[PDB]
Ligand binder design. Structure first.
Ligand SMILES: Nc1ncnc2c1ncn2[C@@H]1O[C@H](COP(=O)(O)OP(=O)(O)OP(=O)(O)O)[C@@H](O)[C@H]1O
Ligand SMILES: Nc1ncnc2c1ncn2[C@@H]1O[C@H](COP(=O)(O)OP(=O)(O)OP(=O)(O)O)[C@@H](O)[C@H]1O
Lengths: 297, 192, 693
């Protein structure tokens, strides 16, 4: 169980609905998708890295401090205002939060100190139209990009057998030169990675409790969802989009809509996910990653 | 399979004006140091190369819109000032970006309305990186010949705005070719 | 008449006499309230219903002590409703006081404001109001089962600021409209609770002994139901097209009308009155309904059908939540602040039921549809939706059509064929008063929804409160125009201004309210309605002098879009006007930005110092100086900016030389240089001069 540190140094576009939307972190779906496409391009085998590996979502970090998503636990006060405005809780204070030891003023201070990047829109045009030869409008369009301070970035949580971890490290060595976002070929999204161990993160990841904090985007398989939702606090997130090299027409190929729990849901009955298939009318199967990575407290 | 890295620096022979804000120039909203978007480089190379001849230009950048789909083979990345230029200008106390004043003459009227434009200082150096993904062995020599031709045309052309008016001329120096993934020799490939 | 209709008719008009007693001028007003209202409602043929007359005449204790009414009758329910809604020298000229001043009088008690400074009422005004209500009851009003909403509409139209109580020793802040309306709602809830529970001897049930009176006050008789709309801030802000402004006015109105039609449809299920809706606005709604197992089963069933429908149409973008928690009469009467406890409990249950929105079978049902569909709507960002002609889906095209109709036509109808898809297999289209009238005489099951029009009296009169203002319609062309109509202003840079505002101290205001003495359901209702009226009427009149268009208004959110200068000026002016309306008890938090034209309005959207020092002093100084001295355009000011932004003493000496070279009056140069020498004054100066360009 290692973590992988990511520093960017170039703006990255991550996207929700259009190109001119900017987003800070990315989900396990696009992460596994990038790993899988990099593997296929490299020509190695996918069986090893399909049904053994567990990937957690990407989360941001700052100078020396790491972050995790806000648990969706019922804190019984009544402000319900400063906490709603909080999105990430530093690791130093995680167990303090889950025991209701976080004060309103401390929450305000954390919100004040949480600057880890800013948003930008760069305007771009496209003269590929008749403009080159005849009177034709240049078509302006915008892309949403997000940048980090020189001491920031994203990090991973990965776990599995050591052989799978070695394969993952190889693939990431390959991948640091492809992208991890949107307009990869337009100049966005190259990174350097580094493997680090953290004593505090390790203790947090190997705790023992009664609840569970979901750190990835997963969906229970058909026969286990019924028992999964006995006592659950969760939010669903729709995940759609097109696919890369499935048929002749990109604009005719579009993945089937899929729904999965978010990255902060709390469950009482642990379930195992699966790599659901979201293909139809296609030559090769298309995958989406739904497999949980729990922390028990 | 393997990946080839093309790294080097570019100089502005005359001032450069990408000007995404426009009359400002593109910057980073915190560091305020000007950059060069990779979209500009990619678009100018693609236009010049296409106008130099539609399979090879399809092959390098990839269109994937015409019922047949081709993944891009050459990735451009953004640029930033070199540390050398920052040190040099700080030592010599030189402003990073100039502001030229201009006009325009109304015919039958001959009254000039002024104009203000912001221009990157001459002689700055930007750092650039290209990544090439060799997917067909028998094509690397032709592809690099084409990319050299594209660089050659770009050296004899302009980037950004008002190129016919006397800005945007650039130059390429200190270019090395290094293989970083895989086992393809990248010592017989040249880009001037 | 159905006994329930008789009960509402009696309840709403129990304290009708108070206005006439306060009138004084007329020969009727010589006797006490109850019998006064008795002869006054006997003057008209339609209101000749004897039981309603009895309800009016026997609404207090002394009359009921000798009333010899039947052991079952609505009058006793009316008595109890008025009591729960609530030495005794009543001044007939007492003016209504604003609750807002009382809301934050604990921190700073300021001279209490009174409606129409020390404003006093005149008995002639009451005479005029009585003549007006006689006119309405004579020509505009008539008792039918479906006319009760019209009665409510006229009562709101007339009485909305006449004080209900006029006790010299009590802090009067209840209008007669509020007291009457809450009395009607509470009485209806009482009637349902007693009838369903199989008690008929209501005199024996409650009037018998005071110990039982407190006992029934203590019994859990009421249910407080709250509704929350899930995804407004997202679904309203997926707009990027050229017609964006037209949709935004249509989209906010679409969500508003969704909430209105769904709440009305609910109240139809409950066989209940419109007075039962305590508060609407934003994505919220509050109701006080009967606490009956029948009520609960109906609520649950309608919730199920409702959730089905939204899952069928949007499936993530819009969802609704239901929640309710038991409350008793003792709770509403503000005994020990438990009103705030129950308010928080219902809020908490509403806010934690949103966690669990989808059962198992639903979530499975979503994930397995290999359904042949088209791609995202351009105007409306949605993958699941299927586009049609010109790459638009049905919903957004109907949005465009109703937006086109918004500016010209004022009435919206709830019809079964219509244009826009709506919850309960219904559709909304637009009408005018004349064809609406024909629809009324067509006895069609219609609900006319109006654009801030009183005195309509057309079928089911629904004066829906909404601020729909657009300066673009003030031009020579009445047709709605695009975003460029505001971009193309030549008085400054061709850009757009946007303002967002929320009342910072609102959560406590609805929850905490006026502490320990005025946290009654009546006064909370009054506070909510006054806030709604401000955020739904006054803005429309205030905006009339600005090139700005109202987009989202209502609840606690204010969204205006237009010219950069006009947005700032209107923001300051509306801030001041609001500080007047709340008497400087509630404040505004706002942020304004500048963006280029035709940018996706979706992404366009995602105090004293600034007025006195920057806008009034430094901005005026700079404007006068730049107007008197020529040749100093954006280049000179931009050199000023280069020297000021880079806070170095070398820039200051350079600026000293530049002001020496400049051809202004020496006063201007000295003031500018000395402003630049102070950090606060240099920041104010750069802000003002940036505003200049
Ligand atoms: N019809 C509307 N059009 C535009 N904005 C609206 C509309 N109705 C309400 N709003 C504003 O949008 C805000 C954001 O709505 P949001 O999606 O956050 O839901 P909400 O009603 O606040 O409840 P919750 O977030 O708890 O689900 C509301 O608080 C309200 O002020
Ligand atoms: N006219 C009104 N009557 C009753 N309740 C209202 C009215 N307008 C708004 N509200 C309610 O008051 C609540 C205020 O919560 P919200 O988070 O929207 O603002 P807030 O808490 O004041 O935010 P902030 O403190 O950050 O300014 C909302 O949930 C809304 O339902």
């Amino acid at each position: 169980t290692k973590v992988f540190k990511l520093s960017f140094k170039t703006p990255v576009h991550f996207g929700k609905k259009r190109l001119s939307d900017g987003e800070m972190t990315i989900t396990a779906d696009t992460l596994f998708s990038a790993l899988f496409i990099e593997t296929l391009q490299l020509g190695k085998d996918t069986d090893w890295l399909l049904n053994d590996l567990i990937i957690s979502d990407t989360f941001p970090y700052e100078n020396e401090l790491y972050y995790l998503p806000k648990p969706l636990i019922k804190i019984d006060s009544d402000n319900h205002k400063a906490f709603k405005k909080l999105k990430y809780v530093p690791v130093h204070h995680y167990n303090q939060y889950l025991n209701g030891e976080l004060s309103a003023e401390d929450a305000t201070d954390l919100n004040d100190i949480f600057n880890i990047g800013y948003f930008s829109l760069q305007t771009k045009v496209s003269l590929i139209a008749q403009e080159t030869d005849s009177s034709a409008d240049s078509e302006p369009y915008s892309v949403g990009t997000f940048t980090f301070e020189p001491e920031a970035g994203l990090y991973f949580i990965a776990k599995g057998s050591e052989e799978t971890l070695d394969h993952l490290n190889n693939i990431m060595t390959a991948l640091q030169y492809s992208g991890l976002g949107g307009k990869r070929n337009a100049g966005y999204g190259q990174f350097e990675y580094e493997i680090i161990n953290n004593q505090q993160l390790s203790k947090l990841l190997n705790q023992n409790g009664k609840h569970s904090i979901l750190l990835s985007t997963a969906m229970a398989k058909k026969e286990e969802i019924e028992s999964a939702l006995k006592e659950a606090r969760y939010i669903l997130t729709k995940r759609s989009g097109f696919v890369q090299s499935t048929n002749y027409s990109e604009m005719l190929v579009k993945k089937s809509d899929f729904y999965s729990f978010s990255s902060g849901s709390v469950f009482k009955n642990i379930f195992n996910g699966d790599i659901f298939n979201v293909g139809h009318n296609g030559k090769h199967p298309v995958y989406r990653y739904a497999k949980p990575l729990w922390l028990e407290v | 399979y393997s990946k080839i890295k093309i790294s080097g620096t570019i100089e502005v022979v005359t001032g450069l004006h990408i000007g995404g804000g426009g009359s400002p120039v593109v910057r980073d909203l915190q560091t305020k140091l000007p950059i060069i978007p990779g979209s500009s480089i990619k678009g100018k190379m693609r236009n010049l190369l296409a106008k130099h001849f539609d399979e090879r230009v399809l092959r390098l950048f990839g269109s994937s819109e015409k019922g047949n789909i081709q993944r891009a083979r050459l990735q451009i990345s953004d640029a930033f000032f070199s540390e050398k230029t920052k040190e040099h200008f700080a030592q010599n106390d030189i402003a990073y970006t100039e502001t030229k004043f201009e006009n325009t003459i109304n015919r039958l009227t001959a009254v000039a309305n002024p104009r203000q434009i912001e221009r990157v200082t001459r002689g700055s150096e930007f750092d650039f990186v290209f990544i090439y993904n060799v997917d067909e062995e028998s094509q690397v020599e032709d592809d690099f010949e084409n990319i050299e031709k594209a660089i050659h045309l770009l050296e004899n052309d302009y980037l950004g705005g008002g190129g016919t008016r006397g800005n945007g001329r650039i130059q390429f120096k200190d270019t090395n070719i290094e293989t970083v993934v895989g086992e393809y020799d990248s010592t017989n490939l040249k880009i001037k | 008449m159905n006994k329930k209709n008789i009960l509402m008719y009696g309840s709403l008009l129990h304290d009708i006499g108070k206005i006439i007693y306060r009138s004084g001028d007329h020969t009727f007003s010589r006797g006490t309230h109850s019998k006064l209202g008795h002869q006054f409602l006997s003057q008209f043929s339609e209101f000749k219903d004897n039981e309603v007359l009895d309800n009016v005449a026997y609404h207090h204790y002394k009359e009921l002590a000798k009333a010899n009414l039947d052991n079952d009758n609505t009058a006793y329910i009316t008595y109890i409703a008025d009591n729960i809604a609530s030495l005794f020298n009543f001044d007939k000229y007492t003016p209504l006081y604003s609750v807002f001043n009382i809301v934050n009088s604990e921190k700073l008690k300021q001279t209490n404001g009174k409606f129409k400074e020390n404003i006093q009422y005149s008995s002639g005004n009451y005479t005029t109001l009585m003549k007006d209500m006689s006119h309405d009851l004579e020509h505009k009003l008539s008792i039918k089962e479906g006319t009760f909403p019209s009665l409510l509409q006229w009562t709101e139209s007339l009485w909305q600021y006449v004080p209900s109580s006029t006790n010299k020793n009590q802090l009067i802040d209840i209008s007669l409209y509020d007291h009457s309306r809450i009395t009607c709602a509470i009485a209806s809830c009482i009637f349902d609770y007693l009838n369903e529970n199989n008690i008929h001897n209501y005199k024996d049930e409650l009037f018998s002994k005071y110990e039982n009176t407190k006992s029934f006050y203590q019994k859990e008789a009421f249910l407080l139901l709250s509704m929350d709309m899930s995804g407004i801030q997202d679904f309203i802000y997926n707009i990027s097209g050229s017609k964006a402004l037209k949709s935004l006015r249509s989209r906010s109105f679409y969500l508003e009308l969704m909430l209105e039609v769904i709440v009305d449809q609910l109240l139809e299920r409950l066989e209940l009155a419109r007075a039962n809706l305590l508060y609407t606005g934003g994505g919220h709604a509050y109701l006080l309904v009967s606490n009956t197992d029948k009520v609960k089963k109906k609520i649950t069933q309608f919730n199920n059908e409702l959730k089905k429908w939204f899952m069928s149409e949007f499936t993530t973008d819009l969802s609704l939540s239901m929640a309710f928690e038991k409350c008793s009469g003792d709770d509403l009467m503000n005994t020990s602040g438990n009103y705030r406890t129950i308010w928080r409990n219902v809020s908490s249950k509403l806010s934690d039921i949103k966690a669990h929105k989808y059962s198992a079978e639903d979530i499975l049902k979503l994930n397995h549809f290999h359904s042949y569909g088209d791609r995202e709507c351009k105007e409306c960002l949605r993958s699941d939706i299927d586009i049609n002609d010109d790459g638009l889906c049905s919903i957004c095209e109907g949005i465009i059509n109703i937006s086109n109709d918004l500016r010209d036509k004022s009435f919206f109808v709830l019809s079964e064929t219509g244009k826009l898809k709506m919850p309960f297999n219904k559709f909304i289209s637009v009408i005018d008063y004349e064809e609406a009238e024909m629809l009324v005489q067509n006895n069609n099951q219609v609900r006319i929804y109006s654009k801030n029009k009183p005195y309509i009296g057309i079928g089911i009169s629904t004066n829906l409160w909404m601020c729909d203002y657009d300066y673009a319609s003030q031009n020579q062309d009445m047709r709605e125009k695009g975003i460029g109509s505001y971009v193309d202003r030549e008085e400054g840079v061709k850009r757009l201004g946007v303002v967002r505002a929320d009342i910072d101290n609102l959560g406590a205001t609805f929850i905490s309210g006026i502490p320990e003495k005025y946290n009654s359901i009546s006064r909370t209702a009054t506070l909510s309605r006054q806030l709604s009226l401000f955020f739904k009427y006054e803005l429309n009149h205030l905006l009339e002098n600005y090139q700005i268009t109202a987009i989202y208004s209502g609840g606690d959110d204010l969204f205006l879009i237009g010219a950069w200068d006009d947005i700032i000026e209107a923001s300051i002016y509306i801030n001041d006007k609001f500080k007047e309306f709340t008497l400087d008890k509630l404040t505004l938090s706002a942020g304004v930005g500048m963006f280029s034209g035709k940018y996706p309005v979706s992404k366009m959207a995602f105090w004293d110092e600034f007025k006195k020092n920057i806008l009034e002093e430094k901005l005026l100084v700079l404007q006068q100086g730049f107007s008197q001295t020529d040749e100093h355009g954006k280049a000179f000011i931009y050199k000023m900016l280069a020297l000021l932004r880079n806070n170095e003493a070398i820039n200051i000496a350079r600026l000293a030389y530049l002001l020496a070279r400049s051809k202004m009056n020496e006063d201007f140069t000295s003031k500018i240089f000395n402003w630049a020498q102070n950090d606060k004054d240099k920041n104010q100066l750069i802000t003002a001069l940036e505003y200049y360009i």
